[PDB]
């Protein structure tokens, strides 16, 4: 998203909690949801561009 | 057949019970035709 | 096994403690026919309304007594948005059609734990006026007798009689004759009921009918030792199966 | 046996399910809906018209309205009041005629009902020659009179509806069809009959009609003593739908 | 057949005595199925 | 002959001076396919939106000059309700879907008499911005050149140039290249145009697109001797043919 148009920004993912997490006594409060981000089986990429060399600075 | 629920048995004849004409020898049609 | 997901349109609801869907009175209550009392072409199901609608219901506490119930009308909770139950394009289709004919399909979610006890009686109750004039309605002697059901006032001409009974009573011991499942705190976190269309006519008015009322009644009160999760929240999911809308007109104004 | 009641379905077991036993041989079938409701019972005791009536005006009725009360029997097992359908049933200004089918609702464990109605009208007066009119569900009573030879004869001597004339000391009995515009009768009802300013739980046309008894003499032959008559109804070919509750038997 | 001991003879027709529906053109089942 | 009735849903519109439907660019412009740029299941046509929508348009007087036009965007007149054109369940479906893909079918009714003269050019014009900033828009030199079409201001950094042209001009002499029919005062009281979906993408956004604009232009001014009916009213009827709604979300808020 250079110019933040609909051709580059495709909306939002959001995680709500529907029902609250029920714990018994003697269990840790605030558990953690570990996120991942993979590609789908129909994911495709096109037009290789020049890199961002900012990792090496 | 009118308001008649009898399907079984007529005791009197059709000339006694009813009154039939003498001789001279569902699909509801329109009452007017455009010709 | 007990892990079932029920897809309907763009909506899929999950449970991992499924007791099986309680189909009411027939094998497939989704099988329905167009009404014989309307000559226009009806509006059948389409993919924007062939879905589940999830609303909240009031929390269940220790203070809630036995037989204290809580009623959800269908489609009356879509009109008034009871429990945040916005009906989307189903209510938008319902306000524009004079008659409507559908069976329902409900799921009431309530997750307890293995340290909680108590039971809820989630039932689909035909033809009650339990939404008419707390968080929970108490089972008094007026509800058990039908003594408080709505009535036409006789006027000043008549001596006002001692009202003692009405046919829209609740016998709280016979609510398991209805299409019901019990939401025990030690068997399941949700229950499934599938009901067909019933009514005095082949199709009924959209704004007035209460052919089915979702009824959540406390059979055993909630109990837990302190430290456990207090006041678990009851929620419900409603899916209309085979609607036949009839009589298209403008959006409903009183 | 090991079961789960939260299923919502519990199979009716026998002695041989857990114990050593057998099945009892099925003796009777008296719980048959078409059989169990096919018997007469006292519905209502109405009074006999000696002149033309004024049918009771709709609710709420104000004072001073000259109408005629206790004369019309609204043929329904549901609670009625003042010859009109009610929702609450009451008992004890003008004392309103209330009726309820006591035998029906103690066995109306269902939501919908439909039958043909067999009405029997028995006189509660010594040697009465009365006459029973009837007008269907959603119809209305014709309330005026015509003068035949200086005698006011009411318009409920004639009509296209049944008028059954009894003998002196005789009875009246005839079967009525399901004439209502509804497919079934709501034993319990949750809707409203109008879009605006309606009562919940009150069906509009859940009845087999309305009967009334009258004396087959003109209005000038009106007596002074009020004559009463009893209304018995039988449900012919009764069908029931959608299982429901039975009323709360109290413990006091 | 109801509370009817008549096995012999119906005098009136089935449309006069009873009231039949119009058309739009032992084994006691359960009232609820677990699916 | 010239008497045709066009039924669409619960709507039938009549004309007894029909010139024949001007189908645009193809034999049947109603034949359309789902978009290839959306993987969700689209919302195709249904009987509550498969109908004609009749709006008014401003009256045509003697004071209205030659080439003075009046533009109706599609579906832009359904959003803003231009000319009392409430779109019913079509606009209610359009505010809830992100993309929409349909061809149109228009009929502009204007009944003159045999004592009136003048001509209107009713045309379906692709991709114009004639609704953007009287009863009738006058053909000035700005409209003929595209000089007044909307533009991004360059800011104070740049010297503001003399704007002299834009590609959304109106050459008023070449408006008969479009799908058009002329509403002559001596041939017909209404004209019919059927257009298919066109666009830069296989489906376009519901809130922004102007792929078709109904354009009613005065070619010959209205004239009549006095005593005749002054200022006859122009009305139009719009029918969406084969809509493919995509991207269901909540109702559109700015």
Coordinates of C-alpha atoms in Angstrom, one line a residue, chain A residues 6-7, chain F residues 200-201:
Chain A
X6 CA -8.8 -0.7 -2.5
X7 CA -6.3 -2.4 -4.9
Chain F
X200 CA -13.0 -1.1 -17.0
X201 CA -13.2 -4.2 -14.7

